Amino acid sequence: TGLSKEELLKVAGSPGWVRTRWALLLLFWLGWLGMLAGAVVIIVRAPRCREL
Amino acid sequence: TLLNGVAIIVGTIIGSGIFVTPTGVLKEAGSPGLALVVWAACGVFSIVGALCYAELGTTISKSGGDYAYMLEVYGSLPAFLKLWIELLIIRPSSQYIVALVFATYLLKPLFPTCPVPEEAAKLVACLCVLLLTAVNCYSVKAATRVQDAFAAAKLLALALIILLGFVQIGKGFEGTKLDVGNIVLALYSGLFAYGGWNYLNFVTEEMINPYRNLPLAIIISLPIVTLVYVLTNLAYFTTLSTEQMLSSEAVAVDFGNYHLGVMSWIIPVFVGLSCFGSVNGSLFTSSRLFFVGSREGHLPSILSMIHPQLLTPVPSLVFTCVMTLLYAFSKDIFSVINFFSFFNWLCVALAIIGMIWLRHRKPELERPIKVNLALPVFFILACLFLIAVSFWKTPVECGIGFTIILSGLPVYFFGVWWKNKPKWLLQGIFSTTVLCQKLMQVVPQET
Numbered sequence A: 001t002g003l004s005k006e007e008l009l010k011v012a013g014s015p016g017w018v019r020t021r022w023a024l025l026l027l028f029w030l031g032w033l034g035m036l037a038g039a040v041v042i043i044v045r046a047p048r049c050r051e052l
Numbered sequence B: 001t002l003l004n005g006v007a008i009i010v011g012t013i014i015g016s017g018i019f020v021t022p023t024g025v026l027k028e029a030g031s032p033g034l035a036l037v038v039w040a041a042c043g044v045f046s047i048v049g050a051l052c053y054a055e056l057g058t059t060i061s062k063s064g065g066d067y068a069y070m071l072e073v074y075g076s077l078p079a080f081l082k083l084w085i086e087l088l089i090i091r092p093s094s095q096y097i098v099a100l101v102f103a104t105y106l107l108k109p110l111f112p113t114c115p116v117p118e119e120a121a122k123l124v125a126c127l128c129v130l131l132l133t134a135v136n137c138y139s140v141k142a143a144t145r146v147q148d149a150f151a152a153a154k155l156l157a158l159a160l161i162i163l164l165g166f167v168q169i170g171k172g173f174e175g176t177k178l179d180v181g182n183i184v185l186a187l188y189s190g191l192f193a194y195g196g197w198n199y200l201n202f203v204t205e206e207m208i209n210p211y212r213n214l215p216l217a218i219i220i221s222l223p224i225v226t227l228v229y230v231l232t233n234l235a236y237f238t239t240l241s242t243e244q245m246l247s248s249e250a251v252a253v254d255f256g257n258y259h260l261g262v263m264s265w266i267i268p269v270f271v272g273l274s275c276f277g278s279v280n281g282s283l284f285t286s287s288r289l290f291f292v293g294s295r296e297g298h299l300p301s302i303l304s305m306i307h308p309q310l311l312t313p314v315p316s317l318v319f320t321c322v323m324t325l326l327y328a329f330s331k332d333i334f335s336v337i338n339f340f341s342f343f344n345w346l347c348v349a350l351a352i353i354g355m356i357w358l359r360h361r362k363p364e365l366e367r368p369i370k371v372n373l374a375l376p377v378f379f380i381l382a383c384l385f386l387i388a389v390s391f392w393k394t395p396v397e398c399g400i401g402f403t404i405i406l407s408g409l410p411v412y413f414f415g416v417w418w419k420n421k422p423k424w425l426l427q428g429i430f431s432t433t434v435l436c437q438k439l440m441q442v443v444p445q446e447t
């Protein structure tokens, strides 16, 4: 069911989907490093506990 | 041999919940003496649960977990509602809980006294679930090695807490609440740590050959788990005050900060790695339910598919992942444990009710294991007891959960039972499907 392997191996035309899938894979790691930077900002600017 | 069977099941059951839930049972049981009794009671409930699943895991034997049994006992709508509950409630919420315990323990050494900032705990929980989603998408050959390793850290951290507890005694109680309401939330918090046996217990039958030896592996192993859980709680109670253990979101780091001096590099690391292993394991083992649920025709055809250069089940991981990441909208970790527990035990109720209804409806169906009816007729009532109290002790969590269940009836009719005939609708469904296929580069599995 759906489009099979034997079709999809030629539907991946490089100017469209291959460049698109490169862009989304970069956007994920850019966005996850964004979320890592966001978490590191919160941990740096949150107020540290007073020592006992 | 049976002795090596127990070493597979005990390492499967022990989990990461033991690093969350001590604070949970203590908050509801009020004082240590009753918290240890609840840990034992959770053990005994798991022994009765596991042997009923030794029966279902050998009578019906169909692959894919509880859904595979629901197809025989109920079919049709109740089988889809099990799959829908398990993919939108159970498997998301237990991943988020373990991803968040990871996050609090990884952060807690930067916040030794004051509570770790929730807005940061939730981002670092998310960073863990996305990173392990990416690793499971890129390579089963890598994500297997990530599972093989950190199962050692799980037991290393948990044994270290006990041996530190023993030297604390070598150098060296009332039960202040007793409301049935709270004691069901104590039982939910304690039962969470045992919560492996309904998913995987049948795996041991592929190496322990006689069917009467599978009950022996259960009956030997779950007392060993109960012993470890009681001993770790004694390690806390012989080191920490009730007024400390209720204040800390990561209780083993308090205990580690007391004894070790090198504290930062030990309990936070070894417990953290155990939870990084447990999030990884829940992703890696998820695909089975999507393959089965789409093969048996309940679940959309795209979620079956695989990325053919890497043989990894990309659309099923991405759906698993995004459901886990929405639980970041929840308020508190023990809110989500209550929520998970209600629907988990309500699913186990439907399964064990089903087993007795099946023993009535189709007698002597060649059962390799046949437990005494005296066990299920207590156990079904114990599932009902937990649920029946929880309807009124925790109404709002059940309300949003039953709102999820009732939202399954539309997609059952539209997706499976009504089989809506319009050709424009079918071409729209097809267009949506091939868009995803082209945008993820994914293909069907070999039928």
Ligand SMILES: CC(C)CCC[C@@H](C)[C@H]1CC[C@H]2[C@@H]3CC=C4C[C@@H](O)CC[C@]4(C)[C@H]3CC[C@]12C
Residues within 6 Å of the ligand: B118, B119, B122, B123, B126, B322, B325, B326, B328, B329
């Ligand atoms: C919406 C679907 C597609 C999921 C993909 C989007 C991801 C990146 C979203 C989903 C839910 C989001 C989280 C939801 C809530 C919170 C709590 C808040 O105090 C800080 C941000 C944080 C922790 C968000 C971070 C980003 C997040 C994880």
Ligand SMILES: CC(C)CCC[C@@H](C)[C@H]1CC[C@H]2[C@@H]3CC=C4C[C@@H](O)CC[C@]4(C)[C@H]3CC[C@]12C
Residues within 6 Å of the ligand: A036, A039, A040, A043, A044, B106, B124, B127, B128, B131
């Ligand atoms: C699963 C992955 C993504 C977890 C990542 C957790 C991140 C947010 C944590 C782990 C270790 C942390 C760092 C450890 C120590 C310090 C020194 C302190 O003076 C400032 C914060 C800083 C610099 C932390 C920033 C946040 C940090 C990088």
Ligand SMILES: CC(C)CCC[C@@H](C)[C@H]1CC[C@H]2[C@@H]3CC=C4C[C@@H](O)CC[C@]4(C)[C@H]3CC[C@]12C
Residues within 6 Å of the ligand: B088, B089, B323, B326, B327, B328, B329, B330, B331, B339, B400, B404
């Ligand atoms: C087919 C797919 C796309 C369906 C998506 C359903 C999503 C939006 C649902 C299913 C389960 C839901 C969660 C169930 C429980 C709670 C606890 C509550 O106190 C806050 C909201 C929160 C955290 C919900 C957020 C939304 C949620 C993640």
